[PDB]
Write a protein that binds this DNA or RNA. Structure first.
Ligand SMILES: N[C@@H]1[C@@H](O)[C@H](O)[C@@H](COP(=O)(O)O)O[C@@H]1O
Ligand SMILES: [Mg+2]
Ligand SMILES: [Mg+2]
Length: 90
RNA sequence: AAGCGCCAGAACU
RNA sequence: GGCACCAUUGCACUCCGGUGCCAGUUGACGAGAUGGGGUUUAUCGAGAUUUCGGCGGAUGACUCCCGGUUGUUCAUCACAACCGCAAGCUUUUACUUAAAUCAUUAAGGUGACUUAGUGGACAAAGGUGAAAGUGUGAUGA
């Protein structure tokens, strides 16, 4: 079902880790306070992000509102995290 | 203040 | 680390697909050492290392000079070795001669790395005094 962490994909792979990590924070900061955004660039983890909210309330609203939103010329695909994240789980 | 200087090899980011 | 091109729609949380091409970073730790000219592969140890490879320089070495020291107390030549404030050869002997490494803890940088402090060290080539044996002939005052 729902989760503190939201899984975003279909992100522009041409954008560098830190720029993407900050450009994400710009738009998701209104829904609630973000604990950490996790972005890698490997073959397995590129075009994806892990915006973690302290509140699931924020995660639900962010999912509803930002679904399909144009981000670097590419529409976002937002799900919930399949499993909890460590800064929540621990 | 001369085992001292710079850097298309090469290792490393 | 970054651009590009191929490949990838991918649920991760100690970094990490392939191909090129550009940027960056590392690249000698101190001791030692300059009369002039030419020549050549330029002294010494420390360090587990790239202190590798290339280029340049260089106070080294050889060798011909310029001066000087010393050669049976003085000079001027021969001849021999020597010195460029320091000066004939050999030997035994005594004293003198660092900084990195390290280990630390601070700054900076995505980054490999950088610059700086603290801790105690640990050399060799040299250098110094001491002895011991010793080093031409010709001519002149
Ligand atoms: N003092 C050193 C010398 O001992 C060394 O011969 C020379 C050449 O160095 P390299 O052999 O790295 O070219 O450099 C310096 O001058
Ligand atoms: Mg490869
Ligand atoms: Mg070299």
């Amino acid at each position: 079902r729902p989760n503190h962490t939201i899984y975003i994909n279909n992100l522009n792979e041409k954008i560098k880790k830190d720029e993407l990590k900050k450009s994400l924070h710009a738009i998701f900061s209104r829904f609630g306070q973000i604990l950490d955004i996790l972005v890698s660039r490997s073959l397995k983890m590129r075009g994806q992000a892990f915006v973690i909210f302290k509140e699931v309330s924020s995660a639900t609203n962010a999912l509803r509102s930002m679904q399909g939103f144009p981000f670097y010329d590419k529409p976002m695909r937002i799900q919930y995290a399949k499993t909890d994240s460590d800064i929540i789980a621990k």
